[PDB]
């Protein structure tokens, strides 16, 4: 089997909603705030080592 | 000298290898052929 990590989606969706709310203070009330994947690097930076 | 670990390939693309090597032992003149397991990230191919 593969090594896997399980995180509850309700809690992660709820916390992620706390971080996105605060970020709007610096960049404006109504702006597109997207989250993306790792854009490159070694295996260390790219994954949750 | 590695042989992929016993697995049914449905893709399972196991990173694990099963490698036998000529390892040293307690005595200098003697040797031993032992095996081990290594993930894909630890070994590279030597042509």
């Amino acid at each position: 089997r593969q090594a896997h990590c399980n995180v509850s989606k309700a809690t992660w969706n709820e916390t992620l909603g706390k971080v996105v709310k605060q970020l709007r203070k610096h960049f404006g009330n109504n702006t597109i705030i997207r989250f993306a994947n790792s854009s490159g690097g070694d295996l260390e930076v790219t994954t949750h080592s | 000298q590695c042989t992929n670990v016993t697995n049914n390939i449905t893709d399972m693309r196991g990173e694990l290898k099963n490698c036998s090597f000529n390892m040293t032992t307690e005595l200098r003149d003697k040797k031993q052929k032992v095996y081990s397991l290594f993930y894909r990230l630890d070994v590279v191919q030597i042509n």
């Epitope: 089997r1 593969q2 896997h4 | 016993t6 697995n7 049914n8 390939i9 449905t10 893709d11 399972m12």
Partner: antibody, heavy 132, light 108 residues
Framework: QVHLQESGPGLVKPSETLSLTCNVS????????WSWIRQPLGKQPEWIGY???????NYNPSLKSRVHLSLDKSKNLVSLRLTGVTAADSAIYYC??????????????????????????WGKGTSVTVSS | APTFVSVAPGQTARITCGEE??????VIWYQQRPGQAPSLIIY??????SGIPDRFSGSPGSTFGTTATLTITSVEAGDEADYYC????????????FGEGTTLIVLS
Amino acid sequence: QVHLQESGPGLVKPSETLSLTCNVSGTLVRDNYWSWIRQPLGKQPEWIGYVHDSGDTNYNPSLKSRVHLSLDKSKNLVSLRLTGVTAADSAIYYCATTKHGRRIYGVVAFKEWFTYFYMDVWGKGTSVTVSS
Amino acid sequence: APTFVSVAPGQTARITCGEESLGSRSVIWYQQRPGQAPSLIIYNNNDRPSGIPDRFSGSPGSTFGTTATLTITSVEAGDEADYYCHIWDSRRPTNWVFGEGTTLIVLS
């Protein structure tokens, strides 16, 4: 009740195209899975691959190139075709309906499950011997 | 190739079939009476199909390092036949040839 009948010549010269037929009654030929199992005299059976609609068909790796299968909804039959038979093909060819199953030992997100097949209802079969 | 097991009438039978388990298995057992066609007994180990008595029991496929086992307690005369096992091992590739069957014979 399911009435399955296995018809075949029973005697075929070497290096000749063998063809059998499995009559089916009680249920449509397309709804259920079908498989062929041959058995040499004094040995263990041998799965000769299964067949089903929607392109679901796999072959035995040993005789994959020589074996063939087909189906037809109108006549409610199952057909087996084998080209280039030899003396090792002398076996009793059974025709049985097959059911699938899902056995899960892992998360299933990364294909940690596998499908197993079992045949519930069989038929009398036909005794086919290859000899010159 | 064949393996014979003698069992007195009305006593427990022990049937060995297949290699050692390397992964989680889905064992299938079949009954081939003399001259007749192979009939299904057990699918997915202890789980059985309609019309089968409870005397037939399959060893669980969750453990590793052991071989499959079909247990028949208080064997009746009709249970005597040839028994084949179909191994579905997660570590092993697809098996297209059944295992070497075991020939159960009541002394009679």
